[PDB]
């Protein structure tokens, strides 16, 4: 059966791999260019603790990428868009009955002016 497909707020995993690579390596290049020069305000101990903090940050982000691709292994038929379209269809169908009720209420409200009162 056909379902209304929605492509909003969804991304491709090729795009998440590419975006994660450009983010981590733009951050690496930025750290290089920031830490070219050594001064009294930024000693090499500060440089090494910043490098350690950066690699723990990259550790965490690539661990979450690892969990993400582990989660993509859970789906076998790759029917997650079928899942999403099914639940949006479910929202439409759960809203149709209340829409019919509100249509009957609008028909009720249409009747307020349409009478003819008792004669005076």
């Amino acid at each position: 059966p056909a379902l209304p497909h929605v492509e909003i707020n969804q991304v491709s995993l090729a795009l998440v791999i590419r975006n994660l690579t450009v983010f981590t390596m733009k951050e690496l290049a930025q750290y290089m260019k920031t830490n070219v020069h050594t001064q009294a305000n930024e000693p090499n101990s500060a440089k090494k603790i910043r490098f350690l903090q950066l690699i723990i940050f990259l550790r965490t982000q690539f661990l979450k990428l690892y969990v993400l691709v582990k989660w993509t292994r859970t789906i076998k038929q790759n029917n997650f868009h079928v899942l999403i379209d099914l639940l949006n269809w479910f929202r439409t169908t759960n809203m149709n009955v209340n829409n019919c009720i509100w249509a009957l209420k609008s028909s009720l409200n249409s009747m307020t002016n349409a009478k003819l009162p008792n004669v005076d």
Binding site: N98, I101, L104, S107, L108, M111, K115, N118
Partner: protein
């Protein structure tokens, strides 16, 4: 005055249609298509006993028939 009561009765009887649809949409429950599938509910849905649910459906229908 008699046509006035007639117009009042039509408006109230269409409002009875609206109220019957309101109750049957908001105060229904969950049922088993099969016995194997799990059954669950939340705090946001008005779960009611099915026997008095059917009783209220029957008395709403009797109110509609009596207004007719």
């Amino acid at each position: 005055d008699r046509l006035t009561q007639l117009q009042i009765c039509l408006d109230q009887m269409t409002e009875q249609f609206c109220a019957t649809l309101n109750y049957i949409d908001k105060n229904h429950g969950f049922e088993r298509l099969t016995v194997n599938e799990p059954q669950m509910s939340d705090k946001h849905a008005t779960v009611v006993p099915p026997e008095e649910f059917s009783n209220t459906i029957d008395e709403l229908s009797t109110d509609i028939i009596l207004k007719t």
